[PDB]
Design an enzyme around this catalytic site. Structure first.
Site, PDB file in Angstrom:
ATOM      1  N   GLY B  72      11.767  -4.027 -10.039  1.00  0.00           N
ATOM      2  CA  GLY B  72      11.346  -4.619 -11.307  1.00  0.00           C
ATOM      3  C   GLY B  72      10.188  -5.166 -11.124  1.00  0.00           C
ATOM      4  O   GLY B  72       9.480  -5.159 -10.341  1.00  0.00           O
ATOM      5  N   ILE B  76       6.971  -5.404  -4.993  1.00  0.00           N
ATOM      6  CA  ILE B  76       6.340  -4.136  -4.915  1.00  0.00           C
ATOM      7  C   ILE B  76       5.660  -3.577  -6.219  1.00  0.00           C
ATOM      8  O   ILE B  76       6.287  -3.617  -7.181  1.00  0.00           O
ATOM      9  CB  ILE B  76       7.398  -3.203  -4.236  1.00  0.00           C
ATOM     10  CG1 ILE B  76       7.941  -3.704  -3.229  1.00  0.00           C
ATOM     11  CG2 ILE B  76       6.661  -1.810  -4.175  1.00  0.00           C
ATOM     12  CD1 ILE B  76       9.281  -3.096  -2.592  1.00  0.00           C
ATOM     13  N   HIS B 114      -6.038   1.902  -3.582  1.00  0.00           N
ATOM     14  CA  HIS B 114      -5.199   1.598  -2.374  1.00  0.00           C
ATOM     15  C   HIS B 114      -4.171   2.488  -2.136  1.00  0.00           C
ATOM     16  O   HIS B 114      -4.035   3.079  -0.778  1.00  0.00           O
ATOM     17  CB  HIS B 114      -4.565   0.236  -2.573  1.00  0.00           C
ATOM     18  CG  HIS B 114      -3.351  -0.257  -1.450  1.00  0.00           C
ATOM     19  ND1 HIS B 114      -4.132  -1.377  -0.521  1.00  0.00           N
ATOM     20  CD2 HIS B 114      -2.407  -0.148  -1.033  1.00  0.00           C
ATOM     21  CE1 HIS B 114      -3.088  -1.434   0.308  1.00  0.00           C
ATOM     22  NE2 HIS B 114      -2.084  -0.765  -0.321  1.00  0.00           N
ATOM     23  N   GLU B 115      -3.184   3.006  -3.203  1.00  0.00           N
ATOM     24  CA  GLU B 115      -2.279   4.108  -2.679  1.00  0.00           C
ATOM     25  C   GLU B 115      -2.958   5.420  -2.292  1.00  0.00           C
ATOM     26  O   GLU B 115      -2.298   6.021  -1.409  1.00  0.00           O
ATOM     27  CB  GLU B 115      -1.597   4.289  -4.011  1.00  0.00           C
ATOM     28  CG  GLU B 115      -0.501   2.850  -4.247  1.00  0.00           C
ATOM     29  CD  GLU B 115       0.168   2.431  -3.179  1.00  0.00           C
ATOM     30  OE1 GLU B 115       0.777   3.080  -2.072  1.00  0.00           O
ATOM     31  OE2 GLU B 115       0.506   1.128  -3.198  1.00  0.00           O
ATOM     32  N   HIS B 118      -3.262   5.525   1.217  1.00  0.00           N
ATOM     33  CA  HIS B 118      -2.040   5.716   1.999  1.00  0.00           C
ATOM     34  C   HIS B 118      -2.054   7.342   1.635  1.00  0.00           C
ATOM     35  O   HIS B 118      -1.513   8.038   2.996  1.00  0.00           O
ATOM     36  CB  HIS B 118      -1.059   5.232   1.295  1.00  0.00           C
ATOM     37  CG  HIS B 118      -0.969   3.617   1.814  1.00  0.00           C
ATOM     38  ND1 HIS B 118      -1.071   3.046   2.887  1.00  0.00           N
ATOM     39  CD2 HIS B 118      -0.670   2.355   0.804  1.00  0.00           C
ATOM     40  CE1 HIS B 118      -0.969   1.801   2.789  1.00  0.00           C
ATOM     41  NE2 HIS B 118      -0.749   1.497   1.589  1.00  0.00           N
ATOM     42  N   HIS B 124      -2.714  -0.068   6.567  1.00  0.00           N
ATOM     43  CA  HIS B 124      -3.040  -1.313   6.236  1.00  0.00           C
ATOM     44  C   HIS B 124      -4.255  -1.971   7.358  1.00  0.00           C
ATOM     45  O   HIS B 124      -4.469  -1.728   8.282  1.00  0.00           O
ATOM     46  CB  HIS B 124      -2.131  -2.406   6.034  1.00  0.00           C
ATOM     47  CG  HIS B 124      -1.282  -2.061   4.889  1.00  0.00           C
ATOM     48  ND1 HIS B 124       0.175  -2.166   5.057  1.00  0.00           N
ATOM     49  CD2 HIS B 124      -1.651  -1.552   3.550  1.00  0.00           C
ATOM     50  CE1 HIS B 124       0.531  -1.889   3.658  1.00  0.00           C
ATOM     51  NE2 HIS B 124      -0.465  -1.432   2.784  1.00  0.00           N
TER      52      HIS B 124
HETATM   53  C1  LIG Z   1       4.332  -0.504   1.507  1.00  0.00           C
HETATM   54  C2  LIG Z   1       4.338  -0.577  -0.032  1.00  0.00           C
HETATM   55  C3  LIG Z   1       5.652  -1.135  -0.488  1.00  0.00           C
HETATM   56  C4  LIG Z   1       3.052  -1.127  -1.022  1.00  0.00           C
HETATM   57  C5  LIG Z   1       1.873  -0.733  -0.156  1.00  0.00           C
HETATM   58  O1  LIG Z   1       1.152  -1.154   0.537  1.00  0.00           O
HETATM   59  O2  LIG Z   1       1.549   0.426  -0.790  1.00  0.00           O
HETATM   60  N1  LIG Z   1       2.923  -2.722  -1.026  1.00  0.00           N
HETATM   61  C6  LIG Z   1       2.822  -3.345   0.373  1.00  0.00           C
HETATM   62  C7  LIG Z   1       4.081  -4.459   0.772  1.00  0.00           C
HETATM   63  N2  LIG Z   1       3.317  -5.002   1.946  1.00  0.00           N
HETATM   64  C8  LIG Z   1       3.351  -4.490   2.914  1.00  0.00           C
HETATM   65  O3  LIG Z   1       3.890  -3.532   3.352  1.00  0.00           O
HETATM   66  C9  LIG Z   1       2.989  -5.423   4.420  1.00  0.00           C
HETATM   67  C10 LIG Z   1       2.871  -5.038   5.573  1.00  0.00           C
HETATM   68  C11 LIG Z   1       2.280  -5.578   6.694  1.00  0.00           C
HETATM   69  C12 LIG Z   1       1.714  -6.881   6.569  1.00  0.00           C
HETATM   70  C13 LIG Z   1       1.859  -7.552   5.236  1.00  0.00           C
HETATM   71  C14 LIG Z   1       1.231  -8.602   4.849  1.00  0.00           C
HETATM   72  O4  LIG Z   1       0.775  -9.653   6.051  1.00  0.00           O
HETATM   73  N3  LIG Z   1       0.993  -9.190   3.649  1.00  0.00           N
HETATM   74  C15 LIG Z   1       0.395 -10.441   3.292  1.00  0.00           C
HETATM   75  C16 LIG Z   1       1.453 -11.322   3.254  1.00  0.00           C
HETATM   76  N4  LIG Z   1       1.206 -12.778   3.010  1.00  0.00           N
HETATM   77  C17 LIG Z   1       1.158 -13.786   3.994  1.00  0.00           C
HETATM   78  C18 LIG Z   1       2.621 -13.924   4.407  1.00  0.00           C
HETATM   79  O5  LIG Z   1       3.257 -12.881   4.834  1.00  0.00           O
HETATM   80  O6  LIG Z   1       2.896 -15.107   4.637  1.00  0.00           O
HETATM   81  C19 LIG Z   1       0.071 -13.987   5.102  1.00  0.00           C
HETATM   82  C20 LIG Z   1       0.495 -12.738   6.316  1.00  0.00           C
HETATM   83  C21 LIG Z   1      -1.275 -13.655   4.589  1.00  0.00           C
HETATM   84  S1  LIG Z   1       1.339 -13.340   1.454  1.00  0.00           S
HETATM   85  O7  LIG Z   1       0.617 -14.515   1.182  1.00  0.00           O
HETATM   86  O8  LIG Z   1       0.905 -12.157   0.501  1.00  0.00           O
HETATM   87  C22 LIG Z   1       2.876 -13.453   0.991  1.00  0.00           C
HETATM   88  C23 LIG Z   1       3.188 -14.963   1.353  1.00  0.00           C
HETATM   89  C24 LIG Z   1       4.539 -15.244   0.888  1.00  0.00           C
HETATM   90  C25 LIG Z   1       5.525 -14.177   0.415  1.00  0.00           C
HETATM   91  C26 LIG Z   1       6.870 -14.434   0.035  1.00  0.00           C
HETATM   92  C27 LIG Z   1       8.008 -13.611   0.295  1.00  0.00           C
HETATM   93  C28 LIG Z   1       9.397 -13.739  -0.229  1.00  0.00           C
HETATM   94  C29 LIG Z   1       9.461 -14.945  -0.871  1.00  0.00           C
HETATM   95  C30 LIG Z   1       8.441 -15.767  -1.131  1.00  0.00           C
HETATM   96  C31 LIG Z   1       7.113 -15.601  -0.487  1.00  0.00           C
HETATM   97  C32 LIG Z   1       4.785 -12.764   0.367  1.00  0.00           C
HETATM   98  C33 LIG Z   1       3.442 -12.539   0.571  1.00  0.00           C
HETATM   99  C34 LIG Z   1       2.329  -6.575   4.053  1.00  0.00           C
HETATM  100  S2  LIG Z   1       2.838  -3.482  -2.396  1.00  0.00           S
HETATM  101  O9  LIG Z   1       3.056  -4.768  -2.208  1.00  0.00           O
HETATM  102  O10 LIG Z   1       3.658  -2.465  -3.093  1.00  0.00           O
HETATM  103  C35 LIG Z   1       1.456  -3.384  -2.600  1.00  0.00           C
HETATM  104  C36 LIG Z   1       0.468  -4.288  -2.265  1.00  0.00           C
HETATM  105  C37 LIG Z   1      -0.903  -4.178  -2.597  1.00  0.00           C
HETATM  106  C38 LIG Z   1      -1.420  -3.163  -3.191  1.00  0.00           C
HETATM  107  C39 LIG Z   1      -2.953  -3.441  -3.607  1.00  0.00           C
HETATM  108  C40 LIG Z   1      -3.422  -2.868  -4.816  1.00  0.00           C
HETATM  109  C41 LIG Z   1      -4.913  -2.845  -5.078  1.00  0.00           C
HETATM  110  C42 LIG Z   1      -5.788  -3.270  -4.177  1.00  0.00           C
HETATM  111  C43 LIG Z   1      -5.237  -3.618  -2.965  1.00  0.00           C
HETATM  112  C44 LIG Z   1      -3.923  -3.867  -2.680  1.00  0.00           C
HETATM  113  C45 LIG Z   1      -0.748  -2.406  -3.574  1.00  0.00           C
HETATM  114  C46 LIG Z   1       0.827  -2.197  -3.355  1.00  0.00           C
HETATM  115 CA   LIG Z   2       7.723  -4.467  -8.744  1.00  0.00          CA
HETATM  116 ZN   LIG Z   3      -0.308  -0.349   1.291  1.00  0.00          ZN
END
Ligand SMILES: CC(C)[C@H](C(=O)O)N(CCNC(=O)c1cccc(C(=O)NCCN([C@@H](C(=O)O)C(C)C)S(=O)(=O)c2ccc(-c3ccccc3)cc2)c1)S(=O)(=O)c1ccc(-c2ccccc2)cc1
Ligand SMILES: [Ca+2]
Ligand SMILES: [Zn+2]
Ligand SMILES: [Ca+2]
Ligand SMILES: [Ca+2]
Ligand SMILES: [Ca+2]
Ligand SMILES: [Ca+2]
Ligand SMILES: [Ca+2]
Ligand SMILES: [Zn+2]
Ligand SMILES: [Zn+2]
Ligand SMILES: [Zn+2]
Lengths: 159, 159
Positions: B72, B76, B114-115, B118, B124
């Site tokens: 939703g 993601i 980004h995609e 992949h 990443h």
């Molecule tokens: C694997 C897929 C599902 C997909 C993808 O990467 O293609 N996604 C990725 C999902 N995430 C991961 O697979 C992943 C894997 C390893 C590490 C990480 C990661 O460290 N991300 C940063 C996380 N953040 C911090 C944290 O986790 O504490 C920190 C490490 C910097 S955060 O600030 O972003 C964050 C903080 C809190 C929360 C949170 C979660 C639950 C409840 C409340 C808050 C989520 C994220 C993410 S995605 O979310 O659909 C996505 C993300 C970014 C883009 C993008 C688009 C344009 C340009 C650049 C990027 C596209 C799609």
């Molecule tokens: Ca979504």
């Molecule tokens: Zn990604």
């Protein structure tokens, strides 16, 4: 730093407050976020208002003295350091986000649950419905529950 | 470190179109996103109409048949399969997001860059300057440039 806190009695302190929310609502969100984890582990969390706490909760923007600069509104929401002394355990929230009691911004409670997970040594989940999945999506905080994967993860770390 | 595409002429097809923007803007965002990667590698991307495209671009919502359900609005944004036959290489965009040409919602061009990374076999990056950093934040699409890290990454796979 290490994989786990070497003790079960862990203190936290709210270092400063976001102007986005009432201070009492910040206190409540953080208290309830710790409770999520104490509910399913032998860990016991106490808030302190003076002295040095294990987990310092901080709101900050941009570069804030830990070599992991925040990035303005959007993008990175928060981050936390794993168990250890000093900066270890500390949880930082990007003040350039708009922190909320419910939705219409970034929910503080849910984000704190996630970040405290990191403070305790938990890494990311690949289950989209786990709170440790690394993406934020609002869910009704009134019905929020840890996923079985989250419970399994934290209990695996703290028997 | 792989899989990688074992060829330099790679085809794509846009299977369907988000109602969030006009079809021409979708075609353009996707074309430009492929060009970003073409500009720094010997890969050549061509849009085709037929049934054996290497990379199929699809908009879908919720559970959509590949065991990686969307969630939703929020959370993601999209996902893509690494190089391979069949669904390999395909890039799926969450239709519950609001896809945009510029700053609001979720920018389609940036997400497609980004995609496609992949789809080409990149993982990443920990560098927040890199398009392969796994958190979305809008940057002015007229000033957007691949980071040195992104270029090193893709050139390590394809030269
Ligand atoms: C694997 C897929 C599902 C997909 C993808 O990467 O293609 N996604 C990725 C999902 N995430 C991961 O697979 C992943 C894997 C390893 C590490 C990480 C990661 O460290 N991300 C940063 C996380 N953040 C911090 C944290 O986790 O504490 C920190 C490490 C910097 S955060 O600030 O972003 C964050 C903080 C809190 C929360 C949170 C979660 C639950 C409840 C409340 C808050 C989520 C994220 C993410 S995605 O979310 O659909 C996505 C993300 C970014 C883009 C993008 C688009 C344009 C340009 C650049 C990027 C596209 C799609
Ligand atoms: Ca979504
Ligand atoms: Zn990604
Ligand atoms: Ca931010
Ligand atoms: Ca600490
Ligand atoms: Ca704020
Ligand atoms: Ca394919
Ligand atoms: Ca949409
Ligand atoms: Zn910090
Ligand atoms: Zn996290
Ligand atoms: Zn899919």
């Amino acid at each position: 730093m290490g994989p786990v806190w070497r003790k079960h009695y862990i203190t936290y302190r709210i270092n400063n407050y976001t102007p986005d929310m009432n201070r009492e609502d910040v206190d409540y969100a953080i208290r309830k976020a710790f409770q999520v984890w104490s509910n399913v582990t032998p860990l016991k969390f106490s808030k302190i208002n003076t002295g040095m706490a294990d987990i310092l909760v901080v709101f900050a923007r941009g570069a804030h003295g830990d070599d992991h600069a925040f990035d303005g509104k959007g993008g990175i929401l928060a981050h936390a350091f794993g168990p250890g002394s000093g900066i270890g355990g500390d949880a930082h929230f990007d003040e350039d986000e708009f922190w909320t009691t419910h939705s219409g911004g970034t929910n503080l409670f849910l984000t704190a649950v996630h970040e405290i997970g990191h403070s305790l040594g938990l890494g990311h989940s690949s289950d989209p419905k786990a709170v440790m999945f690394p993406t934020y999506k609002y869910v009704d905080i009134n019905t929020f529950r840890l996923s079985a994967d989250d419970i399994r993860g934290i209990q695996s770390l703290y028997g």
